[PDB]
Amino acid sequence: KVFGRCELAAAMKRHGLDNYRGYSLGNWVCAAKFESNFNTQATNRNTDGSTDYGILQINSRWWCNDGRTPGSRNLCNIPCSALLSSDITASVNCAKKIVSDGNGMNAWVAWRNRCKGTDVQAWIRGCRL
């Protein structure tokens, strides 16, 4: 599923991601934009053999199991395929764990390089929230 901007903002809010760990909804929408272009089916291979999955490109190195990342963890206790669903519940719940692990949203390189310190409210501007 490719979400619209305000559609994704609403779904993220419904799943309690807005202001989670002090990160406003605009931060999460901006992260999703540059990680996946709002596409739940996005996948990308990393150089080390791990793969990033879903709307927030969660890494199989640590967070999910995809059966082909030797030595990796599965801290969200989920198949990586669950992170590709049209329903974003699994991605949101796993993202809540990731953003809580000490480094906040810096865990998402695209957020740090393209959202952090920017006018992130722009990403929810005009949305009926």
The residues carrying an active-site annotation are 35, 52
Sign of dihedral through CA atoms 33, 99, 116, 24? positive
Q: Which of residues 36-65 bind Br ion (CB under 5 A)?
A: none
* 59 lies in the site for Na ion, by CB under 5 A: no
Closest CA to 33 of 117, 99, 94, 113: 113
* 49: DSSP letter: S
Q: Which is nearer to Na ion, 72 or 91 (CB)?
A: 72
Task: Please indicate if the annotation marks 18 as binding a ligand.
Answer: no
Closest CA to 124 of 4, 1, 6: 6
Task: Tell me which of Br ion, Na ion, none is bound by residue 41, counting a contact when its beta carbon lies within the kind-specific cut-off of 5 to 8 angstroms.
Answer: none
Shortest distance, position 27 Cβ to Br ion, whole Å? 7
* Member of 54, 72, 95, 111 binding Na ion (CB under 5 A): 72
Q: Which of residues 90-129 bind Br ion (CB under 5 A)?
A: 104, 121
Q: Which of residues 94-123 bind Na ion (CB under 5 A)?
A: none
Q: Which long-range contacts (CB under 8 A, 24 or more apart) does 71-79 make?
A: none
Annotated binding site: 101
